[PDB]
Amino acid sequence: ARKFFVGGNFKMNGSLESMKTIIEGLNTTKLNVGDVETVIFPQNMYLITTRQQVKKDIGVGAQNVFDKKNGAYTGENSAQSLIDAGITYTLTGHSERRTIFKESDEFVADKTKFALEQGLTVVACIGETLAEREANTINVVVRQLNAIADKVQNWSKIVIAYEPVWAIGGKTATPEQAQEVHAEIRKWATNKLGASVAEGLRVIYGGSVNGGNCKEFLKFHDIDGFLVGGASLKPEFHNIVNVHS
Amino acid sequence: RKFFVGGNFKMNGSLESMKTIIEGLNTTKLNVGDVETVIFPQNMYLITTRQQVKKDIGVGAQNVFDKKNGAYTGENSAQSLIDAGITYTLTGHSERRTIFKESDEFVADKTKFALEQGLTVVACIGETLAEREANTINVVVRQLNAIADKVQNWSKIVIAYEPVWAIGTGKTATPEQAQEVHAEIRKWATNKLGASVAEGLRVIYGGSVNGGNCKEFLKFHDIDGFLVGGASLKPEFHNIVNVHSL
Numbered sequence: 001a002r003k004f005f006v007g008g009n010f011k012m013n014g015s016l017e018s019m020k021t022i023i024e025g026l027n028t029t030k031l032n033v034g035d036v037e038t039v040i041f042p043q044n045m046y047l048i049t050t051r052q053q054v055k056k057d058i059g060v061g062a063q064n065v066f067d068k069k070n071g072a073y074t075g076e077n078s079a080q081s082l083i084d085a086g087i088t089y090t091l092t093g094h095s096e097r098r099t100i101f102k103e104s105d106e107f108v109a110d111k112t113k114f115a116l117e118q119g120l121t122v123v124a125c126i127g128e129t130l131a132e133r134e135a136n137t138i139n140v141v142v143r144q145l146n147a148i149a150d151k152v153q154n155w156s157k158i159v160i161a162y163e164p165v166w167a168i169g170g171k172t173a174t175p176e177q178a179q180e181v182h183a184e185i186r187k188w189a190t191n192k193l194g195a196s197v198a199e200g201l202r203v204i205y206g207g208s209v210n211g212g213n214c215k216e217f218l219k220f221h222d223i224d225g226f227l228v229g230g231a232s233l234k235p236e237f238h239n240i241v242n243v244h245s
Numbered sequence: 246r247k248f249f250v251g252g253n254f255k256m257n258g259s260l261e262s263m264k265t266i267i268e269g270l271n272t273t274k275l276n277v278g279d280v281e282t283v284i285f286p287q288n289m290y291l292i293t294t295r296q297q298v299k300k301d302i303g304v305g306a307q308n309v310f311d312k313k314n315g316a317y318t319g320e321n322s323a324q325s326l327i328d329a330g331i332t333y334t335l336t337g338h339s340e341r342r343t344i345f346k347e348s349d350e351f352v353a354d355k356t357k358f359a360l361e362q363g364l365t366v367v368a369c370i371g372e373t374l375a376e377r378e379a380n381t382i383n384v385v386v387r388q389l390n391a392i393a394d395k396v397q398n399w400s401k402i403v404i405a406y407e408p409v410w411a412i413g414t415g416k417t418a419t420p421e422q423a424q425e426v427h428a429e430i431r432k433w434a435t436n437k438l439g440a441s442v443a444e445g446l447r448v449i450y451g452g453s454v455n456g457g458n459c460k461e462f463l464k465f466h467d468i469d470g471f472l473v474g475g476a477s478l479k480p481e482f483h484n485i486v487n488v489h490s491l
Contacts, residue, residue: 012317044288064319075308
């Protein structure tokens, strides 16, 4: 059985007051840590103070990382520096970085590989646009995942997040439609990586979800958790994290 | 023009080295009236750096996005920076223009937005090895004109002229060619912005500045400070930051 995983991507948001409020809120919600692996991904400048202030049962992750050792890359986050401060997770390949900053498949794979070597869990993000949904959903996620497979041998500390990029515009993606893609991701992992990798690999839904319908999403057969966007800034996040009780 | 010294830590650091780098700067005696000193740590250290480094030293981000808070995973927000007391940012560093393909226009746009939200911006400009052949002034003027297209008020801009071929290579420009590029930058600003704005505009030299070549620059009247890279992580930065006051 794959452990339920809930990540909260705060994106480019935050003030000192709102980060304190979110963190003190997570510190007081009743977590069954054996039931859920919970991680928050705050805007870069808050990474260290978030790790200091949020309780040990909640992981902290970066929203992006570069693919090289410490060096002359102004503006970037270092995988070495992150884990030296207790930041043990990172996103790679978020659709906003693929689309706005044109991060390539290979660059996302290279960042993933380096972050894994340096000791982080990587939430590697994938997903197709509306134009790609027309006929090429499977081919797009397969291409995105293949690029990571080319560089990464050990998947025990990857979790894949599927973003229905086509729906950020489109309407709301339904749980059915998520299940479809998730099943395809699990087929791909079985064929490329082996059944025992595919059966342990968390595939979390990255499209819009709230605490009321996330139960409807986990009713479907290949959805292991969520990468929550805007709800992760709100009290609603605690009802997604805590859904099993 | 108040002399300006910035220390760009780039993509370096650990808890332990950041602590002692800052400790070193705290116990360094400064003439704040004479030198505006700013350090730009790696993103994750931005708040702890502002908490630990004395008030006389400013803290800056190494980059910022050009929009209000929103769905730009992985970016630094100018509004969030100001809210936490981080009052400076770099824009247009050569490593971002080259590795991440930041265009003149994007750099100008994030400069304008950072300025609107309260930051002082150190906008970086500079020519490559190939461009040094015959095209130095063409390049830096194009890069400046893009900023001028977007920005009306230059009082909280500092210009950092950093020849790409001088970045981390040990090949410092000699002060004599640094002077003449800066003189051209000041002639460009005089024409575009007026003599009054040009005379107030800090133009600082970056690229392999270190504790040993810095004094030579101080003889030159259009070099208004330094942007220091590798050396800002080292104790000799304690010189560079005070050397104008000596």
